[PDB]
Amino acid sequence: QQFGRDIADTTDAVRDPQTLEILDITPCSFGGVSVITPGTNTSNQVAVL
């Protein structure tokens, strides 16, 4: 083996060249940006989720 595959066509692990070492690949974190506001009738302060 050289690289492991997911159920999609993306990688999941890889054999590192120049050292023959095995490394796990997970994607770094993401998410939507949700903004909590009381409305502009009261205040312009917001909280970001």
Binding site: Q1, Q2, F3, G4, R5, I7
Partner: protein
């Protein structure tokens, strides 16, 4: 002389690592319970 293979003739399809999954592939394989030829 003829005999039957039970579950043999399986190998790795695509030189790739998979874990805790079930993968379906289309590749040249030995069929299960087929007549294989025995020579002494």
């Amino acid at each position: 002389a003829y005999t039957n293979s039970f579950t043999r003739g399986v190998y790795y399809p695509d030189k790739v690592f998979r874990s805790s999954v079930l993968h379906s592939t289309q590749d040249l394989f030995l069929p299960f319970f087929s007549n294989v030829t025995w020579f002494h």
